DNA sequence: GCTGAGTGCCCGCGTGCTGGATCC
DNA sequence: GGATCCAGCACGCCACTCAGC
C-alpha cells in the first residue's frame, strides 16, 4: 500500500551497518548500463549545453567548465537532472560560508526570528566564533544560535493560504547566489532564469525532510535548483501519488539537482543525513585548496581561517541545502 | 469537501523532571 | 565526596497535512 512511507522509515532508521543501502543510486559512480535491475530505474546521460556558459563565468562562481560536468536523469522521471559535484576544488567553502554567516543575518528571515529579536540574532557568527576561542565547544552549554538555525527565506515569501507568492515582506535576493543559479540553469538548457525565491535548510544528523509535493501554481517550464553541502544524505524521489515506491539516491557535497516539469510534481523526501565515515570528518571536496589564480571578477574568494574553522566544526555533523525558484514571469513584476 | 489519523510545511509551544556534567 | 546545575527529553497540546469516504 503506502510504499513511500515504508521506504522512508526504512532509510530513516538506517544505521550504516543496520540496513542495506545497495538500492541507493550513486551518481558519482553512475551505472549507465541498460536496466541492471528492477526495481531501480535506468540511469541515462543528460546532454548539457557546453558552449552556453563561458569557463570564466563558471569560474567566477566556483564551477568547473560545463564541458567537464556529467549530468544524469532517470527513465520515467522527465524533468529531473542530477549533476554530481561540479565545483572547482575548494569552491564549496565560499558558498557554505555564505549560507552560515551571511545569508543567516538580517534582513533575511529565519526561524530564529520566531521568538527572538535582532539582538544576538545579528551576533550569531560572533557567538560561534567566541565559542571556538574559549574551547567551550566540548564543554556543556546551551545550543548556539548557529546550532539552532533551521531555515532561511530569501526573496519572495510563500503564502501557504493563497498557495501563491507575494511581495508582502520581500527581502532582496542575494545577487551572487542568483548568478550561480543562473549559470547552472543556462548550463542545463534553461535560458533566462532569474533566481527570485530561495530556501536555505540546515539539517542535523537526526534531521529529516518528510514526504511532500509542491502544490503552488508556478511556471513549470522554469527549473528549481537544489544545492547540497556538507554531510551526505539519502534523497527519495517518488511519484504523482504518495503510495508509489520511490527511488533512492545519494546527495554528496556539491551535488546539484535541477527539477522541471513532470518531476516538479512528484513526492520527494530526505529521510536521513548520513554520519561521516571514520577518519573522514569532512568530505574530500571541502578541504581541497582554491585555485592559485582567481579571476579579478570572481565572486568566490578565500575567507578567514576563523570563519572556515567555524564552518568546518559545524559541518562535521550537518548538511546545508539551497533551493532556488523563479516565481515571476520574465519582465512582469509583482502588482 | 468532511473528518479522524498522522506528523510536525520555508508549522511547532510550555512546563516539570533529571541525571550526567560541572564546581570546589 | 558531595552539593549544584541545567540541556534535553517526555508530555500534552496546537498547527497543519493526509487519507478514506
Ligand atoms: Cl515547485
Ligand atoms: Cl516534463
Author numbering: 20 to 354
From the study:
AlkB family of 2-oxoglutarate (2OG or α-KG)-dependent oxygenases are evolutionarily conserved and implicated in nucleotide demethylation. Mouse ALKBH1 protein has 389 residues and consists of an N-terminal extension (NTE), a nucleotide-recognition lid (NRL), and a C-terminal double-stranded β helix (DSBH) domain. By establishing a reliable in vitro enzymatic assay, we demonstrated that ALKBH1 prefers bubbled and bulged DNAs, instead of ssDNA or dsDNA substrates. Structural studies of ALKBH1 in substrate-free and a 21-mer bulge DNA-bound state revealed the molecular determinants underlying the observed substrate preference, including unique features of a stretch-out Flip1 motif and a functionally indispensable N-terminal “α1” helix.
To obtain a stable and homogenous complex sample for crystallization, we adopted a disulfide cross-linking strategy by introducing a cysteine residue (S235C) in the catalytic pocket and a disulfide-modified cytosine within the bulge. The overall structure of DNA-bound and the free state ALKBH1 superimposed well (r.m.s.dCα = 0.555 Å), except for conformational adjustments of several flexible loops of Flip2 and Flip1 regions. As expected, the structurally stabilized Flip1 element remains in a “stretch-out” conformation even in the presence of DNA substrate, lending further supports to the lack of autonomous base-flipping capability of ALKBH1. Consistent with our previous analysis, the 21-mer bulged DNA substrate is docked onto a wide and positively charged concave surface in between Flip1, Flip2 and α1 (left). The bulged DNA adopts a B-form structure with both strands contributing to enzyme-substrate recognition primarily through “basic-backbone” interactions. Notably, two arginine residues (R24 of α1 and R159 of Flip1) insert into DNA minor grooves from both ends and function as two fingers to hold the DNA substrate (right). Such a recognition mode likely helps to orientate the DNA substrate for proper insertion of the flipped base into the active pocket, which is supported by dramatic activity loss of the R24A and R159A mutants. The observed interaction mode between ALKBH1 and bulged DNA underscores the need of both the flanking duplex/stem region and the flipped base for recognition and catalysis. Our co-crystal structural studies demonstrated that the stretch-out conformation of a K/R-rich Flip1 creates a wide and basic concave surface best for duplex DNA engagement with the flipped methyl base inserted into the active center.
